Structure 1
Amino acid sequence: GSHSMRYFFTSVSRPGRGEPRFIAVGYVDDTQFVRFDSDAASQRMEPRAPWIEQEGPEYWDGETRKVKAHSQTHRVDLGTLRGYYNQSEAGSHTVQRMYGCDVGSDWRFLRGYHQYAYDGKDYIALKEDLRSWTAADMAAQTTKHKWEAAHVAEQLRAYLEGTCVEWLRRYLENGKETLQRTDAPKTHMTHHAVSDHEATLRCWALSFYPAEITLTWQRDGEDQTQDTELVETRPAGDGTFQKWAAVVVPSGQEQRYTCHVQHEGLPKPLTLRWE
């Protein structure tokens, strides 16, 4: 189906001593493929997926140079933003940035994004037109005028629509054995009595990829949300994801209840009933 490349950057100031903690991660779809951590020893961009390891020295040198540049820009911004908000030098603050591009099934550019936050709140973001800026407050408005004057959106648009998608396509090809493979959820139902006349049915979806999934309960063929619990989709730790949905039912009435599973790796949705 469709695909994305995304990078995430976090800088956290350290008022007591030294420079901010800086962590950057890159993803293709739901697969992390690179990382940089200012606390780590290498001080280089590092691979985190097999299909990126084939990239040569020129690649790693450039990604390292670029990611360090991001870190220094963030470091300066922490100082600037402290000033904009008239904040003390005593507190720790955070800058977050994320950017990426999406492509469709034909691998053609679909959309781009580039957004920036201070202390966990929207600060400034590129609009979907890749031309305009959303500034959340008057400090961000100051930044917006600066970025207009510096032709920032133009450069970002060029990257997002061109370079970003070109390299995404490259990665999709090189890592095709996993990146272009869907892993359908392995599903089963468990049963846990909660009294001598009621029980929890838990519908499990395991080892799936990508993370996107829908789990729903029906009772007698109609959606049921009352007396249900749905946990947030969670990483298994091996590149796949997990989720479950549960419903409390009167014991003996389990057969009324069906769990429905929708996932990209399933040609048709699955239906489960307590066995």
Structure 2
Amino acid sequence: SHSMRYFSTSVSRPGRGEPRFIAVGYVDDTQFVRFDSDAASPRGEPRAPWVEQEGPEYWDRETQKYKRQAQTDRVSLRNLRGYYNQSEAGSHTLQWMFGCDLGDGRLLRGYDQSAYDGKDYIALNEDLRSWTAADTAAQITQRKWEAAREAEQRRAYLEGTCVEWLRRYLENGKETLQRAEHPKTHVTHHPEATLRCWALGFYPAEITLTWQWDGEDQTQDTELVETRPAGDGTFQKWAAVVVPSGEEQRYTCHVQHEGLPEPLTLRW
């Protein structure tokens, strides 16, 4: 159930020069590439080991495509300002996201959509041949892209190029991309008292934490934080509960994760 995803952002700064462009790429939960237009020598930079040995031809072609897209965004930002009758003084944001999902081993579904100032603008439909415009301004873009046969080009990338290279990355980095890392767990006691179940250093980010009581889920009184990055490629999460001081040994924490042979059960 692997996937490859790209995220691009352009932000305009009237007066302080031409817009800022940043793009990043992921395979599942692992970043592997970045590009920033404000760097001294702007170029595509690897962020995972399994793309570090692709050769200078590969990385020069990627760099040229990034610089082309930043120039394309600069024109689009000027066009959007005209569609919406906006002044030339304010700052505006344009975001773009695309990628492919794999299953039998081929394309499960593709993505390609855009946003302006935080709201939907235009998106490629799941048929990879028609568009969904969000307002009357985006209808101008749809008419231009239909006349340019542009949906044909995005479908060809998503069904061929996206799938081929995702398979290549998954093979060259299969020792880290296809080997899950199990969480390290422990329970802490904080004085009626508080029981906290920890899970640290796991990959991928998908995980489930559940407190119990003689086999009964305790969902009603469970504090739970959002999954957060550890900073080294792994993730953390904890779930807490409050308990009558004395019944601590009646409660159990349960962990479900890809890196465990079978689900875990913990006590304080």
TM-score higher than 0.5: yes
Residue 40 of structure 1 aligns to a residue whose secondary structure is coil
Residue 220 of structure 2 aligns to a residue whose secondary structure is coil
Residue equivalent to 1:217: 211
Distance 2:123 2:261 in 1: 37
1:87, distance to aligned residue in structure 2 (A): 1.4
1:1-275 equivalent positions in 2, closer than 5 A = 2-104=1-103, 106-193=104-191, 198-274=192-268
**RMSD of Structure 2 on Structure 1 (CA):** 1.3
Q: Deviations over 1:134-181 (max 9, x none)?
A: 222221222122222211221111101110110011111111111111
Distance 1:150 1:214 in 2: 46
Distance 1:135 1:268 in 2: 46
What number of residue pairs does the alignment pair up? 268
Which shows bigger deviation, 76-85 or 249-258?
A: 249-258
1:203, distance to aligned residue in structure 2 (A): 1.0
Distance 1:42 1:66 in 2: 15
Which amino acid in 2 is paired with 1:13?
A: S
Residue 205 of structure 1 aligns to a residue whose secondary structure is strand
Which amino acid in 1 is paired with 2:44?
A: M
1:16, distance to aligned residue in structure 2 (A): 2.4
Distance 1:137 1:271 in 2: 51
1:260, distance to aligned residue in structure 2 (A): 1.9
Residue 226 of structure 1 aligns to a residue whose secondary structure is helix
Contact 1:14–1:20 at 8 Å: present in 2 too? yes
Distance 2:73 2:106 in 1: 31
Q: Deviations over 1:6-54 (max 9, x none)?
A: 1100111011221111110011111110000111122111111111110
- The runs of 5 or more residues in structure 1 that have no matched partner are none
Which amino acid in 1 is paired with 2:264?
A: L
Distance 2:252 2:15 in 1: 56
Distance 1:134 1:223 in 2: 42
In the superposition, the TM-score normalised over structure 2's length comes to 0.96
1:127, distance to aligned residue in structure 2 (A): 1.7
Cα distance, 1:227–1:135 mapped onto 2, change above 3 Å: same
